Amino acid sequence: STGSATTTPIDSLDDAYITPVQIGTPAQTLNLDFDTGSSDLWVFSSETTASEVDGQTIYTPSKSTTAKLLSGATWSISYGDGSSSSGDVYTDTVSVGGLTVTGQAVESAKKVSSSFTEDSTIDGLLGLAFSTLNTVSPTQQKTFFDNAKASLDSPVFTADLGYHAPGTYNFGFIDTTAYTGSITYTAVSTKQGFWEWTSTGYAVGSGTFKSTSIDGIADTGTTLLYLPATVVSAYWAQVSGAKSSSSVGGYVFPCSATLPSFTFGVGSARIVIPGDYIDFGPISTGSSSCFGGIQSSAGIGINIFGDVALKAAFVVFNGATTPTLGFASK
Ligand SMILES: NCc1ccc(C(F)(F)F)cc1
Ligand SMILES: NCc1ccc(C(F)(F)F)cc1
Structure with missing residues (x-):
């Protein structure tokens, strides 16, 4: 069925x-x-x-x-x-x-x-x-x-x-008509009960791809992308006027800025999140400060590939006896 x-x-x-x-x-x-x-x-x-x-x-x-x-x-x-x-x-x-x-x-x-x-x-x-x-x-x-x-x-x-x-x-x-190219599958750990996997690195905009293991969970129930403080600082450094705001509770940026894309690695493949996906709009009605869709996981304890990341891909949750996750561009 x-x-x-x-x-x-x-x-x-x-x-x-x-x-x-x-x-x-x-x-x-x-x-x-x-x-x-x-x-x-x-x-x-x-x-x-x-x-x-x-x-x-x-x-x-x-x-x-x-x-x-x-x-x-x-x-x-x-x-x-x-x-x-x-x-x-x-x-x-x-x-x-x-x-x-x-x-x-x-x-x-x-x-x-x-x-x-x-x-x-x-x-x-x-x-x-x-x-x-x-x-x-x-x-x-x-x-x-x-x-x-x-x-x-x-x-x-x-x-x-x-x-x-x-x-x-x-x-x-x-649905093989729903994505482009091939699906790249990657190993899942179920030891914490999550769809937990390891990303192979990242890039900011058109910058050099940094190979580095990022362990995190694929979570359709979380809105944003939560990543380690080093990665998140590298991203927002490329946005003029962006800063981490303690009163707001995360990185904000001038609403007039254009955001760079963010790339994350799945094995040898790359998923590109367009910069527009990272704009979550004004922090309050009428404000010219906008809230960022990439935030630090430092206070959380685990990295979370939420909707911001998942909606840039076609994602396969393979619940075979050895579970895997598949990612494809679309
Ligand atoms: N979407 C459910 C959910 C929410 C929070 C977490 C956290 F914070 F424990 F990572 C995991 C899963
Ligand atoms: N991550 C689970 C979750 C999903 C939705 C909500 C909301 F939006 F209803 F508050 C809270 C927690």
Whole structure:
């Protein structure tokens, strides 16, 4: 079997991407944030504290003939940005773009942090990291991908995120019409539960490529590109007037500047991020200082190839018994 679904940016800055997902019988369609950096499928629901819901579409298990409460199971998650949510667990039928999984753990939010309440466009998250990170207790649950793996034609999914435009998540097949050239595959470590890999170096604009190993995770659920302080300083040094701002919390630059591209290495291949992808606009309405899409990972503890980097490529998440990541230009 295969599945294919369109994913759409939630705003004009590509801060996140939502993908419609059918849950329950009859279908309740929710727009979820597909997150390869986490492993919980959780939704706003009829159980969510009413004051904490502001425009989101909610899942109502009581209206689904296939929903079953998972007795005694709870979940609680904290994300690297300080957001958090928690609740109880149902099993139900979940379909993504024609691909159906029965008995998927659907985690019903009873409490969500303020950042989720304020994001009216995101109805929940669909985790696509490895199932060892799932937070359901006392019985850990599998991700949608892990549950679908056996019935997929190929145990893969692909992310084709658009720049200010819709894109595609495919499950079970690789669309050879969606990229140019060849796909370069690189080894993945699952030891931390992430799609963790090693980039072979970088270049700024038309500069010399610096060969150097950068270990990081491929994370569709993170907006920006977080890299070591040395790399990030080398990039922003090429932008006139750019500086790291403690009050703002990262590098900013004059909105009138033109940004250089950023290249990162995948084995012997190169993925080029156009400079326009790194512009995240004014720090406040009307400001002439703009926020940069490449920031330091120093305070985070791990390097993160977020949407800024991934949307410049066609990305294969190969969930074979030895997992790999594939990158191609597009
Ligand atoms: N997108 C999920 C996510 C968020 C944060 C992190 C961090 F901060 F731990 F790296 C990993 C994964
Ligand atoms: N990295 C996971 C994640 C994804 C989205 C959000 C947001 F945008 F809803 F705040 C927070 C955390």
